[PDB]
Amino acid sequence: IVGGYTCGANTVPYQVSLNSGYHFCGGSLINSQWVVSAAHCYKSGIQVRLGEDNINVVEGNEQFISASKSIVHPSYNSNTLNNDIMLIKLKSAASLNSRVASISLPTSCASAGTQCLISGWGNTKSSGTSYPDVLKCLKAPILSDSSCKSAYPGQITSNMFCAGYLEGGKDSCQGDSGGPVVCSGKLQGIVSWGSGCAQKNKPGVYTKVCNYVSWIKQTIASN
Numbered sequence: 074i075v076g077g078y079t080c081g082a083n084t085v086p087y088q089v090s091l092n093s094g095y096h097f098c099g100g101s102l103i104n105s106q107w108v109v110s111a112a113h114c115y116k117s118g119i120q121v122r123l124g125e126d127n128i129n130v131v132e133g134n135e136q137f138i139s140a141s142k143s144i145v146h147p148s149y150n151s152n153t154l155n156n157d158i159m160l161i162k163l164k165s166a167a168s169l170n171s172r173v174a175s176i177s178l179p180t181s182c183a184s185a186g187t188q189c190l191i192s193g194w195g196n197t198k199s200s201g202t203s204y205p206d207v208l209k210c211l212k213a214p215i216l217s218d219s220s221c222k223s224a225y226p227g228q229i230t231s232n233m234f235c236a237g238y239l240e241g242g243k244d245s246c247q248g249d250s251g252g253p254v255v256c257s258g259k260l261q262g263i264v265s266w267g268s269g270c271a272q273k274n275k276p277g278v279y280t281k282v283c284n285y286v287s288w289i290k291q292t293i294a295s296n
């Protein structure tokens with residue numbers, strides 16, 4: 074997260090860290106046994122870390138649970154990043170409490186102008202590299218589809234939306250991928266891609282979760 078603020082320990086209780094020996098992507102807990110993330114975060118050997126603030130220090134509220142199954146969306150396209158969503162099943166159910174909690178799926182899509190919360194442990198600089206150890210937060214609005222398509226000609230599908238600031242300075246970034254965009258208490262986006270980070274006229278692009286609710290619910294029901 075570039076240009077954000079320190080969330081505070083366990084104030085984003087649905088945020089997860091995907092660990093393969095190190096943090097490499099975010100995700101969101103959607104019930105006691107399932108996480109949603111970005112398909113471009115796919116790899117084998119994932120451990121899901123819940124209840125994290127400082128990902129390099131054991132602070133006492135963590136739960137570490139290995140993945141038993143990962144399901145990349147059937148139509149994921151790694152070249153365009155269309156359908157950049159995957160589901161991860163945990164080997165055992167998480168213990169839900171005030172600091173580890175699921176985020177509701179949306180019943181309706183969010184409109185441009187809605188303010189959302191984006192969070193992650195990704196890079197905090199637009200030029201250079203500095204990775205934080207505590208969770209960072211950003212409040213950002215959903216941008217109009219017209220402005221999104223104008224920023225990224227020929228690259229925005231109906232399964233994507235832009236959020237952030239056309240003036241630059243505030244954005245998600247590398248290492249935030251897979252993490253949540255929460256608007257009015259519902260999961261509306263997944264950190265997916267962008268051109269650099271926090272650059273003028275290049276806002277972040279997010280997977281549009283409301284398009285996938287039926288697939289998520291059907292998949293969870295049968296796996």
Ligand SMILES: [Ca+2]
Pocket residue numbers: 125126127128129130131132135
């Ligand atoms: Ca920790």
